[PDB]
Design an enzyme around this catalytic site. Structure first.
Site, PDB file in Angstrom:
ATOM      1  N   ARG A   1      -8.073   0.489  -8.591  1.00 25.57           N
ATOM      2  CA  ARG A   1      -8.224   0.936  -9.973  1.00 25.57           C
ATOM      3  C   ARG A   1      -7.146   0.306 -10.850  1.00 25.57           C
ATOM      4  O   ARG A   1      -6.300  -0.437 -10.358  1.00 25.57           O
ATOM      5  CB  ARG A   1      -8.134   2.464 -10.021  1.00 25.57           C
ATOM      6  CG  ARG A   1      -8.793   3.120  -8.812  1.00 25.57           C
ATOM      7  CD  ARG A   1      -8.837   4.637  -8.899  1.00 25.57           C
ATOM      8  NE  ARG A   1      -9.069   5.239  -7.586  1.00 25.57           N
ATOM      9  CZ  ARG A   1     -10.092   4.944  -6.790  1.00 25.57           C
ATOM     10  NH1 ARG A   1     -10.999   4.050  -7.164  1.00 25.57           N
ATOM     11  NH2 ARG A   1     -10.206   5.539  -5.610  1.00 25.57           N
TER      12      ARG A   1
ATOM     13  N   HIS B   1       3.660  10.733   0.871  1.00 25.06           N
ATOM     14  CA  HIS B   1       4.454  10.085   1.916  1.00 25.06           C
ATOM     15  C   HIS B   1       5.961  10.058   1.676  1.00 25.06           C
ATOM     16  O   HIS B   1       6.743  10.422   2.555  1.00 25.06           O
ATOM     17  CB  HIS B   1       3.971   8.640   2.098  1.00 25.06           C
ATOM     18  CG  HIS B   1       2.530   8.525   2.493  1.00 25.06           C
ATOM     19  ND1 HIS B   1       2.104   8.646   3.799  1.00 25.06           N
ATOM     20  CD2 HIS B   1       1.420   8.288   1.756  1.00 25.06           C
ATOM     21  CE1 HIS B   1       0.793   8.485   3.849  1.00 25.06           C
ATOM     22  NE2 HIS B   1       0.353   8.266   2.622  1.00 25.06           N
TER      23      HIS B   1
ATOM     24  N   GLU C   1       1.525   8.091  -3.662  1.00 23.91           N
ATOM     25  CA  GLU C   1       2.246   7.641  -2.479  1.00 23.91           C
ATOM     26  C   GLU C   1       3.571   8.382  -2.313  1.00 23.91           C
ATOM     27  O   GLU C   1       4.007   8.630  -1.186  1.00 23.91           O
ATOM     28  CB  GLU C   1       2.467   6.129  -2.539  1.00 23.91           C
ATOM     29  CG  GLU C   1       1.176   5.326  -2.375  1.00 23.91           C
ATOM     30  CD  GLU C   1       0.507   5.561  -1.033  1.00 23.91           C
ATOM     31  OE1 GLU C   1       1.212   5.529  -0.007  1.00 23.91           O
ATOM     32  OE2 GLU C   1      -0.726   5.760  -0.999  1.00 23.91           O
TER      33      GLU C   1
ATOM     34  N   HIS D   1       0.905  -1.141   0.000  1.00 18.42           N
ATOM     35  CA  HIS D   1       0.000   0.000   0.000  1.00 18.42           C
ATOM     36  C   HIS D   1       0.954   1.203   0.000  1.00 18.42           C
ATOM     37  O   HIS D   1       0.872   2.070  -0.862  1.00 18.42           O
ATOM     38  CB  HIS D   1      -0.893   0.009   1.248  1.00 18.42           C
ATOM     39  CG  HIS D   1      -1.704   1.262   1.411  1.00 18.42           C
ATOM     40  ND1 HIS D   1      -2.668   1.397   2.386  1.00 18.42           N
ATOM     41  CD2 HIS D   1      -1.660   2.451   0.762  1.00 18.42           C
ATOM     42  CE1 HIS D   1      -3.179   2.615   2.335  1.00 18.42           C
ATOM     43  NE2 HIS D   1      -2.583   3.276   1.360  1.00 18.42           N
TER      44      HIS D   1
HETATM   45  N1  5GP Z   1      -5.478   1.941   0.078  1.00 16.18           N
HETATM   46  C1  5GP Z   1      -5.393   2.084  -1.262  1.00 16.18           C
HETATM   47  N2  5GP Z   1      -5.593   3.284  -1.863  1.00 16.18           N
HETATM   48  C2  5GP Z   1      -5.457   3.195  -3.236  1.00 16.18           C
HETATM   49  C3  5GP Z   1      -5.157   2.074  -3.992  1.00 16.18           C
HETATM   50  N3  5GP Z   1      -5.102   2.376  -5.367  1.00 16.18           N
HETATM   51  C4  5GP Z   1      -5.370   3.659  -5.382  1.00 16.18           C
HETATM   52  N4  5GP Z   1      -5.595   4.229  -4.155  1.00 16.18           N
HETATM   53  C5  5GP Z   1      -5.903   5.645  -3.813  1.00 16.18           C
HETATM   54  O1  5GP Z   1      -4.912   6.127  -2.876  1.00 16.18           O
HETATM   55  C6  5GP Z   1      -5.584   6.760  -1.721  1.00 16.18           C
HETATM   56  C7  5GP Z   1      -4.779   6.284  -0.521  1.00 16.18           C
HETATM   57  O2  5GP Z   1      -4.023   7.327   0.114  1.00 16.18           O
HETATM   58  P1  5GP Z   1      -3.108   7.018   1.404  1.00 16.18           P
HETATM   59  O3  5GP Z   1      -4.046   6.531   2.492  1.00 16.18           O
HETATM   60  O4  5GP Z   1      -2.035   6.058   1.105  1.00 16.18           O
HETATM   61  O5  5GP Z   1      -2.521   8.412   1.773  1.00 16.18           O
HETATM   62  C8  5GP Z   1      -7.041   6.314  -1.813  1.00 16.18           C
HETATM   63  O6  5GP Z   1      -7.960   7.300  -1.373  1.00 16.18           O
HETATM   64  C9  5GP Z   1      -7.291   5.968  -3.274  1.00 16.18           C
HETATM   65  O7  5GP Z   1      -7.925   7.047  -3.992  1.00 16.18           O
HETATM   66  C10 5GP Z   1      -4.946   0.809  -3.354  1.00 16.18           C
HETATM   67  O8  5GP Z   1      -4.674  -0.259  -3.880  1.00 16.18           O
HETATM   68  N5  5GP Z   1      -5.088   0.903  -1.938  1.00 16.18           N
END
Ligand code: 5GP
Ligand code: 5GP
Length: 190
Positions: free
Chosen positions: A74, A88, A84, A34
């Protein structure tokens, strides 16, 4: 920063909460990345000013990234990596440039095989109930430190499912340390 949260997600579980539309994760059977989140004082450092995401800097890792870090929600993986990095990764750029940051995540994933650590002890995923203590104990025995478990509750059945597993690392990005936060109750489905 004083540490890293290496967050892996269990695709099927994550997608189980998407009760409408497609979700590629519904078809994956292994833990994927993630994110790699820099930490400080118990909080995730986010949106630190830094270099803009540049796909060319990690062109040599596209095979590994498309395999280990796909978007399970997606079909645009690069968009997920870019998000990411910007939200981050920039927070640890003082010591890890973009290339080294993504390589770090790849190496962490290859060295932290969650299912491989659980399978022998009859703790692998089978859609049934597992003990938080038991699961953390198996991972501690295999990797040496306690992981951080993340659960999510189904709004309909109120059943709790394991969705993510966090491996905590020191600021050097290689030395595992004990995590101190779980969002799981004593039991959950896995
Ligand atoms: N947790 C998660 N978020 C994803 C993924 N693919 C795309 N995203 C996008 O990334 C965001 C996550 O942000 P994070 O929590 O890492 O700051 C989600 O709101 C979503 O729009 C996935 O596989 N897992
Ligand atoms: N477990 C694992 N599989 C990988 C990694 N990098 C690529 N793969 C996969 O291993 C096969 C060979 O990848 P290649 O060596 O051509 O980059 C492909 O099926 C690909 O999906 C990695 O770092 N770890």
């Amino acid at each position: 920063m004083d540490s890293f949260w290496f967050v892996q997600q269990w695709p099927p579980a994550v997608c189980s909460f998407q009760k409408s539309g497609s979700c590629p994760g519904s078809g994956l059977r292994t833990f994927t990345i993630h994110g790699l989140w820099p930490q400080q004082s118990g909080t995730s450092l986010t949106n630190c000013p830094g270099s803009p995401f540049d796909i060319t800097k990690i062109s040599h890792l596209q095979s590994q990234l498309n395999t280990l870090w796909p978007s399970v929600l997606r079909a645009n993986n690069q968009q997920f990596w870019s998000h990411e990095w910007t939200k981050h990764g920039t927070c640890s750029e003082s010591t890890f440039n973009q290339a080294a940051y993504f390589k770090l995540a790849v190496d962490m994933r290859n060295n932290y095989d969650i299912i491989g650590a659980l399978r022998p002890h009859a703790a692998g995923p089978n859609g049934r109930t597992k003990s938080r203590q038991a699961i953390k104990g198996f991972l501690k025995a295999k990797f040496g430190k306690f992981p951080g478990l993340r659960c999510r509750t189904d709004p309909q059945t109120k059943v709790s499912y394991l969705v993510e597993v966090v491996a905590c690392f020191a600021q050097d990005g290689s030395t595992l340390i004990d995590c101190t936060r779980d969002t799981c109750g004593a039991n959950f489905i896995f």
